[PDB]
Amino acid sequence: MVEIILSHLIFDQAYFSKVWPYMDSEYFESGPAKNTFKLIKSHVNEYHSVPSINALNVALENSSFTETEYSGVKTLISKLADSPEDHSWLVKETEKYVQQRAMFNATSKIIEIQTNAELPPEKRNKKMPDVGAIPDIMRQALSISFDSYVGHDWMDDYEARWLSYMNKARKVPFKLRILNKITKGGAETGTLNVLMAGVNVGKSLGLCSLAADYLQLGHNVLYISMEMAEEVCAKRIDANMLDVSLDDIDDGHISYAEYKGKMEKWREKSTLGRLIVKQYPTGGADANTFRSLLNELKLKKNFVPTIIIVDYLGICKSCRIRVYSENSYTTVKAIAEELRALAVETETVLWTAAQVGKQAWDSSDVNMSDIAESAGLPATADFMLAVIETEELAAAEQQLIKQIKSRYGDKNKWNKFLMGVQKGNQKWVEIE
Amino acid sequence: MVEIILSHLIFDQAYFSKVWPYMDSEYFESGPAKNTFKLIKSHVNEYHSVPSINALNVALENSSFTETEYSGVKTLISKLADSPEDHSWLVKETEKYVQQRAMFNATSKIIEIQTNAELPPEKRNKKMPDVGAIPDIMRQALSISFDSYVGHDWMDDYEARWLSYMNKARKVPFKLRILNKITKGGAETGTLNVLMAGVNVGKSLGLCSLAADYLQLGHNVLYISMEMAEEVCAKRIDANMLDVSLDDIDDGHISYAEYKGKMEKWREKSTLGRLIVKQYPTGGADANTFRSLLNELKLKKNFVPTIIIVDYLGICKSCRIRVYSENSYTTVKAIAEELRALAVETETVLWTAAQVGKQAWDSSDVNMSDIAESAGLPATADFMLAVIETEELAAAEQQLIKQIKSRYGDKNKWNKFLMGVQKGNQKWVEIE
Amino acid sequence: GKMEKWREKSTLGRLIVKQYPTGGADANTFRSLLNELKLKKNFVPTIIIVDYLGICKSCRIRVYSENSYTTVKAIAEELRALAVET
Amino acid sequence: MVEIILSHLIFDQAYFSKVWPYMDSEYFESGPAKNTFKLIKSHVNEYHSVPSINALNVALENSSFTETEYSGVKTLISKLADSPEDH
DNA sequence: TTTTTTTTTT
Ligand SMILES: Nc1ncnc2c1ncn2[C@@H]1O[C@H](COP(=O)(O)OP(=O)(O)OP(O)(O)=S)[C@@H](O)[C@H]1O
Ligand SMILES: Nc1ncnc2c1ncn2[C@@H]1O[C@H](COP(=O)(O)OP(=O)(O)OP(O)(O)=S)[C@@H](O)[C@H]1O
Ligand SMILES: [Mg+2]
Ligand SMILES: [Mg+2]
């Protein structure tokens, strides 16, 4: 049914718009269909417009086809006449035909490779790849996109925009009321959020608390620890969930009976996600390793996270440059860009913590210029919180959170607010 | 690798238990391998235990097939030896072989289906799958892999994590009341512990004292001196262990009789550990050099250290920054990260020392900002003790210790505590 | 009601919003996007607005063959060349 | 004496202890010996242990090698055996 | 070899 495909490519515009990128010369035939599709594709890539019948004829005249190909293309172009068909049905049939033809090409290549490899080494040909590259061509036949989004037309796509507005398909709510009220319903899907604070003042504590809350809200959470082992972060999360004090696990003040009892009482709830903690060596993992980790989790453990928390994002590799090849600014900006690209690609909320230069350690006020590792991070950041803590504030068992950078709302409404962080329990609560 | 797989299935149990389920009768061959695996699977089904060579022989005897196949399988069970290869390599190569054989079977089925399709409809078998069934089997070719430990799940790994809780895994006691009290059972294997003090305050004294304390408690210590020679470090260890003042060691007050007697007395103590001292030129020690000499000499001296000490962290050499760099911050941070990574890879407590800034030499208190030569070190350090010295405390033979940073406990609970120092004895004592 | 009221106006143009991965887009990628908007739709922009220039990737430098003042300036020159060309 | 060197690398543990870290790929020849030591290097860098004969000629030795050099490599692997003498 | 950057220290 290639003739219908070509006729609707030429005479229809919505049809051409819907499925251009999945049209390839290897999908029709070795005869007139491929030739006329080559004509169409040449005109398209040359003039950036759907050719008309006159344009196709003109391209035919100044071509290098023999008599047989000329006659076939001329007849096929003559047959091209517009007909009324269902748009969705046409799209579905195009998907079916493209899938079937890709599978046919794949299996033909498989036959060729297997048959030639069966031959003795002298009889076989080196022009054709060995059996080793069977799976890739086997998996490329199943990796056809079939969906292409060119842009968000402001006037033509206001229905979907309003559906996203009312449905809040982007916001991911917190468990703290103050965070929701300052972020207008939580953090969005493809975003990078930052906790800015000094050394040993509650960065990883805050990230573990956020991970615990997300896990409580039925979310698949992937905690990527860079400074402490898997058991340490899992112990912090255990202290947060089971309400066991962190000192108690060390001192053995909790019996295995009660620990297992509350573990069971947590595991029975259906409002509980899956948490996978994956520590990497300090400065030894990159965004490509993160993507491979996601792929392996999905394939083996059937795990696709919705929240990915990376504690101390700074100690990574940019995956584009050699490690320590550049200065701190360049490599950190590249790592942050890769992290936000991963967040937008997987539509996963990405939380992290930022180091602060010595000029703001033990200081009651923290600004965005006080960030240490780079200035390419705050530009790439969608939300930053200062987690300041002075001696007096630490005495009162609280931290001063400052909204130094907010893209979800105005950062001058509730700029200062106190948070009741419980240092022992690795969890913070709202003062209200 | 049919022979290896069959052998380690018959003999090994860890290999058998790790991957029994990912084994199909059609993975092996059309000849003797399939028959032997059929016999193994039949024996496992009849009796839920791994068979033995005699069991395979008798099962072959009571089996019935062609005499040529009988001889082939009998010869096949004549070569299955123990051959204890590595288990990780075993499972990895078995996974590779299984994936290759699954790919071969899928390819063969695809060829058969395509050949059946390219036939007149009269001469076709309806039992054969249609062309449309080809894609899904391709997924069955790609969706084959052994389950592997990807991350640390917080729920379905809680029992092992509790095992790591009740067992004080990754803990090394200190033989000192305040140290074990503040670290909640010693430092953890694969961490960074640092002493920050001014110039000539007792950093090397402290490291030697810790090395001796570990040596008493049956610990192997890899001392790496960057400033002092091996003889000097051995002398400091002697002064700490034998309670001989540094004056008496080089003034001749120590006699060979007493020295020999005390040495043999410590030799008879089976609780005594093993200590070595490797010296490197100032700024000429590398992480790769750490592993090399230990690797070959580990075979040569059967010595593996629980505690690795690197004197004067600030004057080491990086294994990633190839050329010398004037930037203190980047180089020192990279060196600290390299040290922490080496410690975690070897799973051994790493101790070091650090230099305070020029402004902290005359100060009675030391802050974390007053560190020198970098700010990446306080970020990479799991534990930091400031050895504060002042004239009044020096007169009282006491040095203040202030836990600047602690990931083992709360650094505000016992932040400041006096520790008695015997500089002549080069020893640490706890004030009661 | 407001959307349809704006659509009723004959003085209203067209707005196309396209998001690119941070670092993934390029001046040649921008040109390909313009060609795609001319092909798929009848859209030929008169105003092009980019949130930030330096995020993009140079079409001539491979990845980071040189420093910041060889890629950022190259992208700026490529974007001005795009403006002149279109 | 590359054959003796590789034989004692594979079979003698004490020899591997004092001689392997000072060994390199380009220290034997450009023929089969280089390929054999490359296989050994890959195995040791992948598992931190000396490969067995089976781990060498079965798991490896099935890489992208031409027949002329693959035959030589398998011949070299065949002629490997321990030699009793002092370390 | 020009640049841009974060940084420690006189
Ligand atoms: N194991 C622990 N037991 C008890 N309290 C702890 C423990 N670890 C940390 N704390 C407390 O939590 C505070 C912050 O700890 P962290 O979670 O490491 O915050 P941090 O800022 O990420 O630390 P770094 O190493 O600078 S990133 C410390 O100052 C202690 O008061
Ligand atoms: N051989 C020695 N004899 C007597 N006292 C010594 C000796 N070595 C060090 N000390 C004393 O021990 C204290 C500092 O010793 P060390 O630990 O060697 O110095 P440090 O902490 O390593 O600082 P550095 O490395 O010299 S900048 C001072 O009070 C010295 O007087
Ligand atoms: Mg922390
Ligand atoms: Mg000293």
PDB file of N, CA and C in Angstrom, chain D residues 39-86:
ATOM      1  N   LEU D  39      45.989 -11.064  25.833  1.00  0.00           N
ATOM      2  CA  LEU D  39      44.902 -11.811  26.460  1.00  0.00           C
ATOM      3  C   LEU D  39      45.115 -11.922  27.963  1.00  0.00           C
ATOM      4  N   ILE D  40      46.349 -12.222  28.377  1.00  0.00           N
ATOM      5  CA  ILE D  40      46.653 -12.323  29.802  1.00  0.00           C
ATOM      6  C   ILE D  40      46.427 -10.984  30.492  1.00  0.00           C
ATOM      7  N   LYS D  41      46.855  -9.893  29.852  1.00  0.00           N
ATOM      8  CA  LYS D  41      46.664  -8.561  30.413  1.00  0.00           C
ATOM      9  C   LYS D  41      45.187  -8.246  30.583  1.00  0.00           C
ATOM     10  N   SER D  42      44.381  -8.553  29.565  1.00  0.00           N
ATOM     11  CA  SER D  42      42.949  -8.305  29.667  1.00  0.00           C
ATOM     12  C   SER D  42      42.339  -9.105  30.808  1.00  0.00           C
ATOM     13  N   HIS D  43      42.699 -10.386  30.917  1.00  0.00           N
ATOM     14  CA  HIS D  43      42.117 -11.220  31.963  1.00  0.00           C
ATOM     15  C   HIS D  43      42.504 -10.719  33.350  1.00  0.00           C
ATOM     16  N   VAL D  44      43.779 -10.379  33.546  1.00  0.00           N
ATOM     17  CA  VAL D  44      44.221  -9.955  34.872  1.00  0.00           C
ATOM     18  C   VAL D  44      43.648  -8.585  35.220  1.00  0.00           C
ATOM     19  N   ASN D  45      43.545  -7.685  34.240  1.00  0.00           N
ATOM     20  CA  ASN D  45      42.950  -6.385  34.510  1.00  0.00           C
ATOM     21  C   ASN D  45      41.444  -6.474  34.687  1.00  0.00           C
ATOM     22  N   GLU D  46      40.827  -7.570  34.250  1.00  0.00           N
ATOM     23  CA  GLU D  46      39.397  -7.754  34.439  1.00  0.00           C
ATOM     24  C   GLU D  46      39.047  -8.543  35.694  1.00  0.00           C
ATOM     25  N   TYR D  47      39.974  -9.341  36.230  1.00  0.00           N
ATOM     26  CA  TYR D  47      39.669 -10.180  37.379  1.00  0.00           C
ATOM     27  C   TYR D  47      40.735 -10.170  38.464  1.00  0.00           C
ATOM     28  N   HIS D  48      41.839  -9.446  38.272  1.00  0.00           N
ATOM     29  CA  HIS D  48      42.880  -9.298  39.293  1.00  0.00           C
ATOM     30  C   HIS D  48      43.436 -10.652  39.728  1.00  0.00           C
ATOM     31  N   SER D  49      43.537 -11.580  38.781  1.00  0.00           N
ATOM     32  CA  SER D  49      44.081 -12.899  39.059  1.00  0.00           C
ATOM     33  C   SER D  49      44.630 -13.487  37.769  1.00  0.00           C
ATOM     34  N   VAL D  50      45.628 -14.349  37.909  1.00  0.00           N
ATOM     35  CA  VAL D  50      46.245 -14.967  36.731  1.00  0.00           C
ATOM     36  C   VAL D  50      45.253 -15.938  36.096  1.00  0.00           C
ATOM     37  N   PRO D  51      44.989 -15.832  34.797  1.00  0.00           N
ATOM     38  CA  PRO D  51      44.053 -16.762  34.159  1.00  0.00           C
ATOM     39  C   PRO D  51      44.597 -18.179  34.133  1.00  0.00           C
ATOM     40  N   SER D  52      43.681 -19.136  34.202  1.00  0.00           N
ATOM     41  CA  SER D  52      44.045 -20.524  33.989  1.00  0.00           C
ATOM     42  C   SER D  52      44.217 -20.789  32.497  1.00  0.00           C
ATOM     43  N   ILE D  53      44.665 -22.002  32.172  1.00  0.00           N
ATOM     44  CA  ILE D  53      44.788 -22.379  30.768  1.00  0.00           C
ATOM     45  C   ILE D  53      43.418 -22.390  30.103  1.00  0.00           C
ATOM     46  N   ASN D  54      42.412 -22.944  30.787  1.00  0.00           N
ATOM     47  CA  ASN D  54      41.052 -22.918  30.259  1.00  0.00           C
ATOM     48  C   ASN D  54      40.533 -21.492  30.147  1.00  0.00           C
ATOM     49  N   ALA D  55      40.764 -20.673  31.173  1.00  0.00           N
ATOM     50  CA  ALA D  55      40.328 -19.284  31.133  1.00  0.00           C
ATOM     51  C   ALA D  55      41.021 -18.485  30.042  1.00  0.00           C
ATOM     52  N   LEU D  56      42.126 -18.991  29.500  1.00  0.00           N
ATOM     53  CA  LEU D  56      42.873 -18.314  28.452  1.00  0.00           C
ATOM     54  C   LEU D  56      42.476 -18.783  27.058  1.00  0.00           C
ATOM     55  N   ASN D  57      42.470 -20.095  26.826  1.00  0.00           N
ATOM     56  CA  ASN D  57      42.235 -20.625  25.490  1.00  0.00           C
ATOM     57  C   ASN D  57      40.763 -20.864  25.177  1.00  0.00           C
ATOM     58  N   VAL D  58      39.864 -20.710  26.147  1.00  0.00           N
ATOM     59  CA  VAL D  58      38.451 -20.977  25.902  1.00  0.00           C
ATOM     60  C   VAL D  58      37.652 -19.684  25.990  1.00  0.00           C
ATOM     61  N   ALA D  59      37.669 -19.043  27.162  1.00  0.00           N
ATOM     62  CA  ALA D  59      36.952 -17.782  27.316  1.00  0.00           C
ATOM     63  C   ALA D  59      37.515 -16.721  26.380  1.00  0.00           C
ATOM     64  N   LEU D  60      38.822 -16.512  26.428  1.00  0.00           N
ATOM     65  CA  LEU D  60      39.515 -15.716  25.435  1.00  0.00           C
ATOM     66  C   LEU D  60      39.973 -16.643  24.316  1.00  0.00           C
ATOM     67  N   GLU D  61      40.837 -16.127  23.438  1.00  0.00           N
ATOM     68  CA  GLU D  61      41.336 -16.842  22.265  1.00  0.00           C
ATOM     69  C   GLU D  61      40.227 -16.944  21.221  1.00  0.00           C
ATOM     70  N   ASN D  62      39.023 -16.506  21.586  1.00  0.00           N
ATOM     71  CA  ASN D  62      37.893 -16.426  20.671  1.00  0.00           C
ATOM     72  C   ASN D  62      37.544 -14.977  20.346  1.00  0.00           C
ATOM     73  N   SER D  63      38.554 -14.114  20.293  1.00  0.00           N
ATOM     74  CA  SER D  63      38.368 -12.717  19.938  1.00  0.00           C
ATOM     75  C   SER D  63      38.532 -12.558  18.428  1.00  0.00           C
ATOM     76  N   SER D  64      38.601 -11.313  17.959  1.00  0.00           N
ATOM     77  CA  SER D  64      38.724 -11.031  16.529  1.00  0.00           C
ATOM     78  C   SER D  64      40.192 -11.148  16.129  1.00  0.00           C
ATOM     79  N   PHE D  65      40.625 -12.389  15.927  1.00  0.00           N
ATOM     80  CA  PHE D  65      41.975 -12.697  15.483  1.00  0.00           C
ATOM     81  C   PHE D  65      41.918 -13.399  14.137  1.00  0.00           C
ATOM     82  N   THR D  66      42.831 -13.029  13.244  1.00  0.00           N
ATOM     83  CA  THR D  66      42.926 -13.706  11.960  1.00  0.00           C
ATOM     84  C   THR D  66      43.413 -15.137  12.155  1.00  0.00           C
ATOM     85  N   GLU D  67      43.080 -15.995  11.189  1.00  0.00           N
ATOM     86  CA  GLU D  67      43.373 -17.418  11.326  1.00  0.00           C
ATOM     87  C   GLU D  67      44.870 -17.674  11.455  1.00  0.00           C
ATOM     88  N   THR D  68      45.685 -16.946  10.688  1.00  0.00           N
ATOM     89  CA  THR D  68      47.126 -17.175  10.716  1.00  0.00           C
ATOM     90  C   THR D  68      47.718 -16.899  12.093  1.00  0.00           C
ATOM     91  N   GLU D  69      47.268 -15.840  12.766  1.00  0.00           N
ATOM     92  CA  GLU D  69      47.764 -15.548  14.103  1.00  0.00           C
ATOM     93  C   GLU D  69      47.003 -16.298  15.186  1.00  0.00           C
ATOM     94  N   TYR D  70      45.723 -16.604  14.958  1.00  0.00           N
ATOM     95  CA  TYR D  70      44.966 -17.396  15.922  1.00  0.00           C
ATOM     96  C   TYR D  70      45.551 -18.797  16.062  1.00  0.00           C
ATOM     97  N   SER D  71      45.941 -19.409  14.941  1.00  0.00           N
ATOM     98  CA  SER D  71      46.583 -20.718  14.997  1.00  0.00           C
ATOM     99  C   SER D  71      47.895 -20.653  15.768  1.00  0.00           C
ATOM    100  N   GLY D  72      48.691 -19.609  15.531  1.00  0.00           N
ATOM    101  CA  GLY D  72      49.931 -19.457  16.272  1.00  0.00           C
ATOM    102  C   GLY D  72      49.702 -19.259  17.758  1.00  0.00           C
ATOM    103  N   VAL D  73      48.682 -18.477  18.115  1.00  0.00           N
ATOM    104  CA  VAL D  73      48.374 -18.257  19.525  1.00  0.00           C
ATOM    105  C   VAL D  73      47.955 -19.562  20.188  1.00  0.00           C
ATOM    106  N   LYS D  74      47.111 -20.349  19.516  1.00  0.00           N
ATOM    107  CA  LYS D  74      46.706 -21.622  20.106  1.00  0.00           C
ATOM    108  C   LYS D  74      47.877 -22.592  20.190  1.00  0.00           C
ATOM    109  N   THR D  75      48.799 -22.535  19.226  1.00  0.00           N
ATOM    110  CA  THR D  75      49.999 -23.358  19.304  1.00  0.00           C
ATOM    111  C   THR D  75      50.845 -22.965  20.508  1.00  0.00           C
ATOM    112  N   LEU D  76      51.004 -21.658  20.731  1.00  0.00           N
ATOM    113  CA  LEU D  76      51.750 -21.189  21.894  1.00  0.00           C
ATOM    114  C   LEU D  76      51.089 -21.639  23.189  1.00  0.00           C
ATOM    115  N   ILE D  77      49.762 -21.523  23.268  1.00  0.00           N
ATOM    116  CA  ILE D  77      49.052 -21.937  24.477  1.00  0.00           C
ATOM    117  C   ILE D  77      49.218 -23.432  24.704  1.00  0.00           C
ATOM    118  N   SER D  78      49.230 -24.216  23.624  1.00  0.00           N
ATOM    119  CA  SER D  78      49.414 -25.657  23.761  1.00  0.00           C
ATOM    120  C   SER D  78      50.770 -25.988  24.373  1.00  0.00           C
ATOM    121  N   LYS D  79      51.821 -25.282  23.958  1.00  0.00           N
ATOM    122  CA  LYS D  79      53.178 -25.572  24.422  1.00  0.00           C
ATOM    123  C   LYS D  79      53.528 -24.733  25.654  1.00  0.00           C
ATOM    124  N   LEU D  80      52.666 -24.823  26.664  1.00  0.00           N
ATOM    125  CA  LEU D  80      52.894 -24.177  27.951  1.00  0.00           C
ATOM    126  C   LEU D  80      52.812 -25.231  29.042  1.00  0.00           C
ATOM    127  N   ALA D  81      53.860 -25.324  29.858  1.00  0.00           N
ATOM    128  CA  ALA D  81      53.894 -26.282  30.952  1.00  0.00           C
ATOM    129  C   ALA D  81      54.875 -25.799  32.009  1.00  0.00           C
ATOM    130  N   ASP D  82      54.641 -26.225  33.246  1.00  0.00           N
ATOM    131  CA  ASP D  82      55.502 -25.830  34.352  1.00  0.00           C
ATOM    132  C   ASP D  82      56.875 -26.479  34.218  1.00  0.00           C
ATOM    133  N   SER D  83      57.907 -25.741  34.614  1.00  0.00           N
ATOM    134  CA  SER D  83      59.281 -26.225  34.574  1.00  0.00           C
ATOM    135  C   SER D  83      59.864 -26.188  35.981  1.00  0.00           C
ATOM    136  N   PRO D  84      60.195 -27.331  36.580  1.00  0.00           N
ATOM    137  CA  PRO D  84      60.676 -27.344  37.970  1.00  0.00           C
ATOM    138  C   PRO D  84      62.101 -26.817  38.073  1.00  0.00           C
ATOM    139  N   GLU D  85      62.244 -25.619  38.635  1.00  0.00           N
ATOM    140  CA  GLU D  85      63.552 -25.037  38.907  1.00  0.00           C
ATOM    141  C   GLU D  85      63.380 -23.924  39.934  1.00  0.00           C
ATOM    142  N   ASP D  86      64.508 -23.388  40.395  1.00  0.00           N
ATOM    143  CA  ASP D  86      64.505 -22.416  41.479  1.00  0.00           C
ATOM    144  C   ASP D  86      63.899 -21.087  41.037  1.00  0.00           C
TER     145      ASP D  86
END
